[PDB]
Amino acid sequence: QISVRGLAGVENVTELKKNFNRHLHFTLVKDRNVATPRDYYFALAHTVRDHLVGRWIRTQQHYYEKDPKRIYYLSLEFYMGRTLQNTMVNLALENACDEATYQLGLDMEELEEIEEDAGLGNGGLGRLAACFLDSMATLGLAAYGYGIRYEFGIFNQKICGGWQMEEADDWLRYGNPWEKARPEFTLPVHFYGRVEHTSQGAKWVDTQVVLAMPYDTPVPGYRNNVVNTMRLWSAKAPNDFNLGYIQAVLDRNLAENISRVLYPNDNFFEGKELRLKQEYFVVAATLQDIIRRFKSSTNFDAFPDKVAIQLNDTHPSLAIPELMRVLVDLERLDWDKAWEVTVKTCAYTNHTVLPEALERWPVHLLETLLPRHLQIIYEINQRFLNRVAAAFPGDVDRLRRMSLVEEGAVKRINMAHLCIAGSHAVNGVARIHSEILKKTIFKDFYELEPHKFQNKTNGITPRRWLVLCNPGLAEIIAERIGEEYISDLDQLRKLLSYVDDEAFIRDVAKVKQENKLKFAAYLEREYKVHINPNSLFDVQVKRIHEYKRQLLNCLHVITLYNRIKKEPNKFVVPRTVMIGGKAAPGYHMAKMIIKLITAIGDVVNHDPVVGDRLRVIFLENYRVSLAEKVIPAADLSEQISTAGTEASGTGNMKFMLNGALTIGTMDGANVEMAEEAGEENFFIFGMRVEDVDRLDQRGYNAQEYYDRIPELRQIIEQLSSGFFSPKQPDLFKDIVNMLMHHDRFKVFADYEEYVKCQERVSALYKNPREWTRMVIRNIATSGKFSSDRTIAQYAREIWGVEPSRQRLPA
Ligand SMILES: *Cc1c(COP(=O)(O)O)cnc(C)c1O
């Protein structure tokens, strides 16, 4: 079919077909007369899975033999999505399987749609971890992803009456063919108990035990025969647990609830005990596994030379005191030596500066759940502050500002401070974010240990985010520059010499048009909503949050609508405005924004005068699999967070790599994207970080914008009067109130420039040729945003290991 999808050899197509039938029969226990599409999907999944095992076994045997430094990526989230196609792509089996299933009279694409998304993440943070695993495998690093095997991942979103309804993501219902339970490696995790101080050392006793059972999932590198491992822990109650009899057995649920469900909060800290248990659970089991693997390879001096632990934000921050606990209490190392090892082993990555997202655990919680860890944290704080006091004599405020322990209503432990103190490297996820860390939130820490602070701008894997989701684009690109770019995205720059190539311009635009037609079709298939494929696809997909400002997008949509109603017979570039994303269940304002979006669509989509000139659609249940479909079909990417709030963003990179132009603020990675492509090829608008600060010093008064902008005033009055909610006139009173009196994200402040910028977008879209040429300039300079580049920097500048593009014998 198409080049980049590999060869469809005679022998291997034949082999695939027989193994497919072999699995349908022996594995699924079905025949062609009673098999359902799902059975066929599993037969294929198992057939592909078989090609992984050989490589998986030798990759691990390889690491045992060579004993390289091991990288442990600890995260509470891994947003993997579907695994079938990704596996075929990395094993160069896509065309062969496509052919084999074709000959069996089956449509492989239909079968791929049956696989459930592995949604063990909320959004960008979990997706980053998934892209990172892909890149580490592709770069030949002996890396392991460690997390929790949630029984229920991010909830499936249903839109009822325009309101978000959540329903359990029972992703394991039909089983998971990709994982391999490893019950033989089960480890005990301790909770509660008390600390006993004996002759030689302290002892943590009278604890309640929960077993951690690991499940391994293979992570194949891109065509290098490397298959790494993602190990996810599942909670299991010991058998003597609580041992009326019946009740004791039913109460096992209490212990196993630890790995039951993913907390659905994106950029928001919820200090619940269950969450703390999850954090310790993943940390405790992982560290024991790490140490056990090390002892094989008694003197932990070399521990840092053979182990690197990366903390994905503070969620797994307990790894620092847990490592100290094990080394001091169990291995009997002196404190100072244990600390040296811990710091040299741990590295911390911060992903946000939003105050409500930072973890600050109540001391009383740690006191009851992890008594020994609290003592260790106090000791760490004591020694850390002595260092601060020695470096800044007499600066008592610095002492209280840097303390890991925060005083006040209830004493809390600042996990971020803990991470900085116990790590040899701390990094932000985009240049501007890392600078903000050094200038604001972590300024005191940067002044004490400037050497620790680094930047590692995020990235996305070009395998899933280009080859897999946009084969048509990957193909026309391969046609001109070869396939090498798939694992060396910088090579896309060569496309710059085709910016004036008429054939290429035509192909780029053709691929986009095809993606839009395919998506427009999908919308009618699974959701029954008609849209015009000739319109500009204006899309904003990401979690619903005030800082991401879906509300600013909404104001623009209403502006466009009001302008059309004012001058109906005036021409305007047709637009299909698509907004999608999930709101955390307890985030009221986020849920109201979703309702506002659907309410706007209700009015706009049924107004006869508007016609097919403007359509507002809310993409339901936005997740990884849906991102793979809508991003390749997008023309305009909305990355409009208030400057200084989106640490990096990654959706922005996906859109850039897939041929969409970007309208956004100078926030997060947007700054570097504009820098790489050139500001003239980016639709930048709004306040920069400095402008936001100037406004805060002066005091943000929304009323001022309302009084000086007639169009804005009209919108607010429409919202307040019930124009978008006839039966419930004051339905959006909370939204208006917030916008007018307590908008922490200054939506009104960027309104004018945003609308103006949006006009420049429409202007360019009217010139197909020039729009496409600008698109080419974006795609051609998106190379820096490959997670391979990001991982290579982590490897060389933090973990101290060299990436390799060497194939392993398959
Ligand atoms: C890439 C991705 C994200 C992150 O998007 P941003 O716009 O950076 O917040 C969130 N959700 C899904 C499903 C993604 O694929």
mmCIF file with all atom_site columns, C-alpha atoms in Angstrom, residues 109-205:
data_model
loop_
_atom_site.group_PDB
_atom_site.id
_atom_site.type_symbol
_atom_site.label_atom_id
_atom_site.label_alt_id
_atom_site.label_comp_id
_atom_site.label_asym_id
_atom_site.label_entity_id
_atom_site.label_seq_id
_atom_site.pdbx_PDB_ins_code
_atom_site.Cartn_x
_atom_site.Cartn_y
_atom_site.Cartn_z
_atom_site.occupancy
_atom_site.B_iso_or_equiv
_atom_site.pdbx_formal_charge
_atom_site.auth_seq_id
_atom_site.auth_comp_id
_atom_site.auth_asym_id
_atom_site.auth_atom_id
_atom_site.pdbx_PDB_model_num
ATOM 1  C CA . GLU A 1 109 ? -8.557  -0.724  10.385 1.00 0.00 ? 109 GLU A CA 1
ATOM 2  C CA . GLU A 1 110 ? -11.949 -1.934  11.584 1.00 0.00 ? 110 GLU A CA 1
ATOM 3  C CA . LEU A 1 111 ? -10.184 -4.301  13.969 1.00 0.00 ? 111 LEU A CA 1
ATOM 4  C CA . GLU A 1 112 ? -7.863  -1.604  15.327 1.00 0.00 ? 112 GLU A CA 1
ATOM 5  C CA . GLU A 1 113 ? -10.895 0.457   16.366 1.00 0.00 ? 113 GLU A CA 1
ATOM 6  C CA . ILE A 1 114 ? -11.922 -2.370  18.689 1.00 0.00 ? 114 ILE A CA 1
ATOM 7  C CA . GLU A 1 115 ? -8.900  -2.057  20.986 1.00 0.00 ? 115 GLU A CA 1
ATOM 8  C CA . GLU A 1 116 ? -9.569  -0.166  24.213 1.00 0.00 ? 116 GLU A CA 1
ATOM 9  C CA . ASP A 1 117 ? -7.404  2.856   24.963 1.00 0.00 ? 117 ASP A CA 1
ATOM 10 C CA . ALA A 1 118 ? -5.059  2.178   27.863 1.00 0.00 ? 118 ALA A CA 1
ATOM 11 C CA . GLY A 1 119 ? -6.016  5.363   29.706 1.00 0.00 ? 119 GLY A CA 1
ATOM 12 C CA . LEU A 1 120 ? -3.845  5.299   32.801 1.00 0.00 ? 120 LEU A CA 1
ATOM 13 C CA . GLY A 1 121 ? -3.313  9.038   32.594 1.00 0.00 ? 121 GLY A CA 1
ATOM 14 C CA . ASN A 1 122 ? -5.140  12.366  32.760 1.00 0.00 ? 122 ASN A CA 1
ATOM 15 C CA . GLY A 1 123 ? -3.510  14.033  29.810 1.00 0.00 ? 123 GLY A CA 1
ATOM 16 C CA . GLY A 1 124 ? -0.177  15.610  28.985 1.00 0.00 ? 124 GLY A CA 1
ATOM 17 C CA . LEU A 1 125 ? 1.763   14.336  31.990 1.00 0.00 ? 125 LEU A CA 1
ATOM 18 C CA . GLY A 1 126 ? 0.775   10.726  31.405 1.00 0.00 ? 126 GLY A CA 1
ATOM 19 C CA . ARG A 1 127 ? 1.164   11.028  27.622 1.00 0.00 ? 127 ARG A CA 1
ATOM 20 C CA . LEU A 1 128 ? 4.659   12.466  28.080 1.00 0.00 ? 128 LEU A CA 1
ATOM 21 C CA . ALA A 1 129 ? 5.621   9.372   30.053 1.00 0.00 ? 129 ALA A CA 1
ATOM 22 C CA . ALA A 1 130 ? 4.289   7.172   27.225 1.00 0.00 ? 130 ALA A CA 1
ATOM 23 C CA . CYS A 1 131 ? 6.185   9.099   24.522 1.00 0.00 ? 131 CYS A CA 1
ATOM 24 C CA . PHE A 1 132 ? 9.272   8.943   26.724 1.00 0.00 ? 132 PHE A CA 1
ATOM 25 C CA . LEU A 1 133 ? 9.082   5.144   26.988 1.00 0.00 ? 133 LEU A CA 1
ATOM 26 C CA . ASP A 1 134 ? 8.835   4.909   23.200 1.00 0.00 ? 134 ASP A CA 1
ATOM 27 C CA . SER A 1 135 ? 11.896  7.168   22.754 1.00 0.00 ? 135 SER A CA 1
ATOM 28 C CA . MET A 1 136 ? 13.975  5.375   25.387 1.00 0.00 ? 136 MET A CA 1
ATOM 29 C CA . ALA A 1 137 ? 13.370  2.045   23.654 1.00 0.00 ? 137 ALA A CA 1
ATOM 30 C CA . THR A 1 138 ? 14.149  3.627   20.290 1.00 0.00 ? 138 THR A CA 1
ATOM 31 C CA . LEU A 1 139 ? 17.371  5.062   21.711 1.00 0.00 ? 139 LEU A CA 1
ATOM 32 C CA . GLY A 1 140 ? 18.504  1.736   23.143 1.00 0.00 ? 140 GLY A CA 1
ATOM 33 C CA . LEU A 1 141 ? 18.390  2.761   26.797 1.00 0.00 ? 141 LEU A CA 1
ATOM 34 C CA . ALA A 1 142 ? 17.990  0.106   29.492 1.00 0.00 ? 142 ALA A CA 1
ATOM 35 C CA . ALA A 1 143 ? 14.892  1.878   30.811 1.00 0.00 ? 143 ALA A CA 1
ATOM 36 C CA . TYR A 1 144 ? 11.894  0.724   32.810 1.00 0.00 ? 144 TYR A CA 1
ATOM 37 C CA . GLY A 1 145 ? 8.625   2.544   33.270 1.00 0.00 ? 145 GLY A CA 1
ATOM 38 C CA . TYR A 1 146 ? 7.168   2.013   36.749 1.00 0.00 ? 146 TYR A CA 1
ATOM 39 C CA . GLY A 1 147 ? 3.616   2.852   37.703 1.00 0.00 ? 147 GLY A CA 1
ATOM 40 C CA . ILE A 1 148 ? 0.290   1.578   38.935 1.00 0.00 ? 148 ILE A CA 1
ATOM 41 C CA . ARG A 1 149 ? -1.981  -0.769  37.026 1.00 0.00 ? 149 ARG A CA 1
ATOM 42 C CA . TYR A 1 150 ? -5.250  1.041   37.670 1.00 0.00 ? 150 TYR A CA 1
ATOM 43 C CA . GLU A 1 151 ? -8.316  -1.134  37.287 1.00 0.00 ? 151 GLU A CA 1
ATOM 44 C CA . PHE A 1 152 ? -10.088 1.977   36.044 1.00 0.00 ? 152 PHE A CA 1
ATOM 45 C CA . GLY A 1 153 ? -8.219  4.651   34.098 1.00 0.00 ? 153 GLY A CA 1
ATOM 46 C CA . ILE A 1 154 ? -9.488  8.086   33.135 1.00 0.00 ? 154 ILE A CA 1
ATOM 47 C CA . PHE A 1 155 ? -13.295 7.983   32.974 1.00 0.00 ? 155 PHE A CA 1
ATOM 48 C CA . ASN A 1 156 ? -15.159 7.796   29.682 1.00 0.00 ? 156 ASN A CA 1
ATOM 49 C CA . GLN A 1 157 ? -16.986 11.073  29.106 1.00 0.00 ? 157 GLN A CA 1
ATOM 50 C CA . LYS A 1 158 ? -20.611 11.118  27.986 1.00 0.00 ? 158 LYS A CA 1
ATOM 51 C CA . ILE A 1 159 ? -22.412 14.335  27.093 1.00 0.00 ? 159 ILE A CA 1
ATOM 52 C CA . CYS A 1 160 ? -26.010 14.322  28.306 1.00 0.00 ? 160 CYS A CA 1
ATOM 53 C CA . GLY A 1 161 ? -28.162 17.388  27.848 1.00 0.00 ? 161 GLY A CA 1
ATOM 54 C CA . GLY A 1 162 ? -24.940 19.224  27.152 1.00 0.00 ? 162 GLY A CA 1
ATOM 55 C CA . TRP A 1 163 ? -23.550 18.178  30.543 1.00 0.00 ? 163 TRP A CA 1
ATOM 56 C CA . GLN A 1 164 ? -20.577 15.917  31.199 1.00 0.00 ? 164 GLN A CA 1
ATOM 57 C CA . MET A 1 165 ? -21.441 12.547  32.693 1.00 0.00 ? 165 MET A CA 1
ATOM 58 C CA . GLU A 1 166 ? -18.673 10.258  33.898 1.00 0.00 ? 166 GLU A CA 1
ATOM 59 C CA . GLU A 1 167 ? -18.694 6.502   33.569 1.00 0.00 ? 167 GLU A CA 1
ATOM 60 C CA . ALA A 1 168 ? -16.126 3.961   34.717 1.00 0.00 ? 168 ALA A CA 1
ATOM 61 C CA . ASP A 1 169 ? -13.368 3.093   32.253 1.00 0.00 ? 169 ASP A CA 1
ATOM 62 C CA . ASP A 1 170 ? -13.512 -0.699  32.616 1.00 0.00 ? 170 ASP A CA 1
ATOM 63 C CA . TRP A 1 171 ? -10.610 -1.123  30.162 1.00 0.00 ? 171 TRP A CA 1
ATOM 64 C CA . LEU A 1 172 ? -9.711  -4.625  31.391 1.00 0.00 ? 172 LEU A CA 1
ATOM 65 C CA . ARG A 1 173 ? -13.242 -5.965  30.826 1.00 0.00 ? 173 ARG A CA 1
ATOM 66 C CA . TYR A 1 174 ? -12.282 -8.119  27.811 1.00 0.00 ? 174 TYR A CA 1
ATOM 67 C CA . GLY A 1 175 ? -8.727  -8.687  29.021 1.00 0.00 ? 175 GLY A CA 1
ATOM 68 C CA . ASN A 1 176 ? -5.392  -7.115  28.094 1.00 0.00 ? 176 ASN A CA 1
ATOM 69 C CA . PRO A 1 177 ? -3.328  -9.193  25.627 1.00 0.00 ? 177 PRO A CA 1
ATOM 70 C CA . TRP A 1 178 ? -0.317  -6.919  25.952 1.00 0.00 ? 178 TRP A CA 1
ATOM 71 C CA . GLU A 1 179 ? 0.428   -7.419  29.638 1.00 0.00 ? 179 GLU A CA 1
ATOM 72 C CA . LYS A 1 180 ? 2.100   -10.349 31.356 1.00 0.00 ? 180 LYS A CA 1
ATOM 73 C CA . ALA A 1 181 ? 1.344   -10.903 35.026 1.00 0.00 ? 181 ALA A CA 1
ATOM 74 C CA . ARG A 1 182 ? 4.454   -11.708 37.037 1.00 0.00 ? 182 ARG A CA 1
ATOM 75 C CA . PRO A 1 183 ? 2.960   -12.956 40.362 1.00 0.00 ? 183 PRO A CA 1
ATOM 76 C CA . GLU A 1 184 ? 6.300   -14.587 41.135 1.00 0.00 ? 184 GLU A CA 1
ATOM 77 C CA . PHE A 1 185 ? 7.751   -11.099 41.647 1.00 0.00 ? 185 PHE A CA 1
ATOM 78 C CA . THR A 1 186 ? 5.117   -9.931  44.135 1.00 0.00 ? 186 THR A CA 1
ATOM 79 C CA . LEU A 1 187 ? 6.465   -7.692  46.881 1.00 0.00 ? 187 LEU A CA 1
ATOM 80 C CA . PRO A 1 188 ? 5.082   -6.514  50.236 1.00 0.00 ? 188 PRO A CA 1
ATOM 81 C CA . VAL A 1 189 ? 4.348   -2.844  50.904 1.00 0.00 ? 189 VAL A CA 1
ATOM 82 C CA . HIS A 1 190 ? 3.858   -1.558  54.455 1.00 0.00 ? 190 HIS A CA 1
ATOM 83 C CA . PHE A 1 191 ? 1.453   1.017   55.865 1.00 0.00 ? 191 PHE A CA 1
ATOM 84 C CA . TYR A 1 192 ? 0.684   2.519   59.281 1.00 0.00 ? 192 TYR A CA 1
ATOM 85 C CA . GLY A 1 193 ? 2.480   0.866   62.188 1.00 0.00 ? 193 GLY A CA 1
ATOM 86 C CA . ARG A 1 194 ? 4.877   2.724   64.487 1.00 0.00 ? 194 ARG A CA 1
ATOM 87 C CA . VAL A 1 195 ? 8.580   3.414   64.933 1.00 0.00 ? 195 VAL A CA 1
ATOM 88 C CA . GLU A 1 196 ? 10.610  1.575   67.559 1.00 0.00 ? 196 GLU A CA 1
ATOM 89 C CA . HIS A 1 197 ? 14.040  2.880   68.556 1.00 0.00 ? 197 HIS A CA 1
ATOM 90 C CA . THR A 1 198 ? 16.328  0.042   69.617 1.00 0.00 ? 198 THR A CA 1
ATOM 91 C CA . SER A 1 199 ? 20.009  -0.326  70.448 1.00 0.00 ? 199 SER A CA 1
ATOM 92 C CA . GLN A 1 200 ? 21.141  -0.362  66.832 1.00 0.00 ? 200 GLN A CA 1
ATOM 93 C CA . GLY A 1 201 ? 18.759  1.599   64.623 1.00 0.00 ? 201 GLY A CA 1
ATOM 94 C CA . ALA A 1 202 ? 15.054  2.335   64.333 1.00 0.00 ? 202 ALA A CA 1
ATOM 95 C CA . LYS A 1 203 ? 12.457  -0.267  63.340 1.00 0.00 ? 203 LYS A CA 1
ATOM 96 C CA . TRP A 1 204 ? 9.115   0.217   61.612 1.00 0.00 ? 204 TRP A CA 1
ATOM 97 C CA . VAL A 1 205 ? 6.774   -2.329  63.217 1.00 0.00 ? 205 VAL A CA 1
#
